[PDB]
Structure 1
Amino acid sequence: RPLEQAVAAIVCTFQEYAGRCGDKYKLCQAELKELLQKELATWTPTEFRECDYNKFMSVLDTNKDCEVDFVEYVRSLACLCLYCHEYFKDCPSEPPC
């Protein structure tokens, strides 16, 4: 159930931000950035993922399109794990991402 609760919570957060206004199935990059920075504030990159992390977060600043769907939102979460979670420290898999 732990994964059930976790996945339910990831959809909850998406609904919170996407449901603000307009298309309830889409986010702007700015909303996605805000989401990540506020909901995952304590998450910071690991040793060899610092540069990858920064480029990722700058892209969310630069890019200002609003076609971010749920799948892309979740992908961003995955990317943050590869950058900030110690388990993936030595992962020779350069962020997809």
Structure 2
Amino acid sequence: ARPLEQAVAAIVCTFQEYAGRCGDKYKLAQAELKELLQKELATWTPTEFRECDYNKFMSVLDTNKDAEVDFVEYVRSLACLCLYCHEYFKDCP
């Protein structure tokens, strides 16, 4: 398949793997979102000038572990992690 097709299918596969464990298959607890980021993006780490934002982001996931997130908010979390951990965005003001 085309590269973005494979990628977006994989973003949905990972969501199904976690959200589909039990309960509402369209929801993740933030605790499960943090688990998913930690295991599935284990090697992603903030770029040189984004440590503080990244640390605040991860901090907010712990403090609201029981709040739920839907798929669109899961994808948003992925996007934020790109802003903090992908070199393309290092100069993004």
Interval containing the TM-score (normalised by the shorter chain) = over 0.9
Partner of 2:31, secondary structure, is helix
TM-score by length of 2: 0.95
**Partners of 1:85 and 1:23 in 2: CA distance:** 32
Query: Partners of 2:66 and 2:73 in 1: how far apart?
Result: 13
Taking every aligned residue pair, what percent have the same amino acid on both sides? 97
Structure 2, unaligned runs of 5 or more:
none
TM-score normalised to the size of structure 1?
0.91
Tell me, yes or no, if the aligned pair for 1:26 and 1:66 is still in contact at 8 Å.
no
Deviation per CA, 1:26-75, whole angstroms, max 9, x where unpaired? 00000000000100000000111100000000111111234200000000
- Output the aligned Cα RMSD: 1.5
Unaligned segments of structure 1, at least 5 residues = 92-96
In structure 1, the residue matched to 2:51 is 50
Equivalent residues, number: 92
- Runs (4 or more) in structure 1 with deviation over 3 Å come to none
Supply the distance in 2 between the matched residues of 1:28 and 1:67 (Cα, whole angstroms).
4
- Greater percentage in strand: 2
